[PDB]
Subunit: 385 residues, 2 copies
């Protein structure tokens, strides 16, 4: 069959709740994916950083098969051997007392909200049912969520005044908003306003962490250490849904042994995959590679596109990059379709921004080729407006 | 490294949000698990029906390795080949137009709420922001839910009167409430009251389906066909978090292509695992085995415990079984600890009920042994009051 047989098939038997680019993948390896007709593309989404280590990494697969032969799941009604090995590994690596393993990024957010509010009541003695969490505006009305603009220390402290605030949950760079990088001063001041007003400084590193911006934690760029870290995506090198919350004893122990719905969270298979996925990231110096290739690539891109009419701005840090377009001049869906035609696949957030986030095992020669591709694709829309 | 060592390690590095029975598993295979000290136990939880096919089923592992070598994840920004194969397979199997793949049971519930309400507004023309969902009381306050007692057709129709009701979401047997089986009349009448008042009849089969009670869908016992089915757990034979919603075009097409958050949902690896996990269930006649061994086991158990002072009731259907205890006479945690000591592991829900749900590949000789174990365990407590 053809790519078109697959797409019609999904249209008949699957819900229509997603709107994918019309490409049908059957294989991935490192920085490349391959469609039904055996065309090859650079993957510039990386499944939103799940494959920082590259597609189908053999070491991760190996750790997977090994654990899967032994035991894939017992519930949280019992202990497994693998979970605690993972927990010890992660806490030591990142320097936190404790970790809580879950499946999805959404689970990690929701559990973080609960953790923050419960620390609010137990430790900060906030009045009942009124613990407030501060989040940023465009990225991360809804009750007891106070919204402030990103990268605005003034508006933040203004909200920290409220004694009922238990936490500020924030991304080191805003992903969904279109890759918004903060001013260098911001986070050093976030750490201060938070330490000052006795507020949990929670860093959402589900996308930004694990090498994406050059470091294990993007916050390490700003030389701050958050009270609470959220991790996900690359935790598994894409082989399994895994997420985690890291925190010290004073916050984590606020959670009590309770009766929770059944889960895959903390299962033995995920635990083994997670350790190996981070070992691969580290042993292969993938954070370093992204830290080296990143800024050059971004600057070189900013240079070659400086005269483009349709480009509004090139943004990024490490290999977390994006191009924002003037959506009054071009349709961004069409830009993505053109990238695809040109051998590079990615997707647009909102109406304006295209994500540029390749697996971190990419070589400089490959990034040069991808630069050609990006320039040629933008050129097309410039030549034809 | 002793079990004790594993448990202390988890206590130091992991959150204390769960309260497991003190057994540390390192291996599972079919109906058995094995701890650090190589003791063997019958698994009578089955990770809440995730391992209906038994632990570490080699066919499922095989389908997993095969797909994992090719591609584990691209996001929903693109198409994969594997997803549509899975969707076609499931819709045909269960007889619904469409399916929507997700990761967790909780995701399936939340998505079901949105699906129901959106059908409420689009099709049933319910006024905005006021679509109401009927759930049952002990098992499944909050905005836009209406709670009725389980197995009560009167209280149900009373609530169906409200024109703003879009759906009734209900379990074929109540799990969390302690395995509550409905009167044979109930579901045939649920199907009627629902068809009559123009209300979505949504069956939550996340625990009850896929052979657990003898059939692919427990509702098949009552000869009704729900408008919407929720599936999970055994969908993957415990190798991966997978859940699904099945529904026909008139309901499913209510969800439109959108900018949804990054997901593992519908990833190629889950899709391949899911098809094979159901193939194994069906090729091995696991539904049939549970349908055969189930009632005998339950009746024989009801008989051998008829004179017990601590036992309140034996309940079940197929291999979805439970013993409720008089919590005024015994501590149910201690009962579980004693089961463990006796070679069978399980857990208690609430203060009263112990879950009895072995993998469905269990043999009659095995169930006879387990019967001895359950009787001897209950004997221990009886001999002491």
């Amino acid at each position: 069959k053809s790519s078109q047989d697959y797409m019609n098939n999904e249209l008949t038997y699957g819900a229509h709740n997603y709107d994918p680019i019309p490409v049908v993948l059957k294989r991935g390896k490192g920085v490349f994916v391959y469609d039904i007709e055996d065309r090859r593309y650079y993957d510039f989404l990386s499944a939103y950083s799940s494959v920082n280590q590259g597609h189908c990494h053999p070491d991760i697969l190996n750790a997977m098969i090994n654990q899967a032969k032994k035991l894939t799941i017992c519930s949280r009604a019992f202990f497994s051997d693998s979970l605690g090995v993972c927990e010890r590994y992660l806490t030591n690596l990142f320097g936190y007392d404790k970790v809580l393993m879950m499946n999805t990024g959404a689970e990690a957010s929701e559990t973080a909200y609960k953790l923050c509010r419960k620390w609010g009541y137990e430790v900060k003695k906030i009045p009942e049912n009124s613990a407030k969490i501060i989040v940023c505006n465009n990225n991360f009305f809804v009750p007891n969520f106070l919204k402030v603009p990103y990268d605005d220390l003034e508006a933040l402290e203004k909200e920290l005044q409220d004694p009922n605030v238990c936490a500020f949950i924030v991304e080191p760079v805003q992903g969904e908003a279109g890759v918004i990088v903060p001013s260098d001063s911001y986070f050093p001041g976030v750490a201060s306003l938070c330490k000052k007003y006795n507020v949990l400084f929670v860093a959402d590193e589900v996308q930004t962490g694990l090498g994406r911006t050059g470091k294990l934690l993007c916050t390490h760029h700003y030389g701050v250490k958050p009270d609470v870290i959220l991790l996900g995506k690359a935790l598994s090198g894409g082989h399994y849904p895994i997420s985690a919350i890291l925190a010290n004893d004073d916050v984590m122990l606020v959670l009590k042994p309770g009766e929770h719905g059944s889960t895959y969270g903390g299962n033995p298979l995920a635990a083994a995959i997670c350790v190996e996925a981070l070992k691969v990231l580290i042993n292969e110096k993938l954070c370093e590679n992204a830290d080296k290739l990143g800024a050059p690539f971004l600057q070189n891109l900013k240079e070659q596109l400086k005269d483009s009419k349709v480009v509004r701005e090139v943004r990024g840090k490490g290999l977390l990059c994006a191009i924002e377009f003037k959506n009054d001049l071009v349709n961004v869906w069409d830009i993505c379709l053109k990238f695809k035609e040109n051998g590079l696949i990615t997707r647009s957030v909102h109406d304006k921004t295209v994500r540029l986030t390749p697996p971190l095992c990419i070589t400089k020669e490959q990034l040069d080729e991808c630069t050609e591709i990006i320039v040629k694709t933008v050129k097309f829309f410039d030549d034809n407006l």
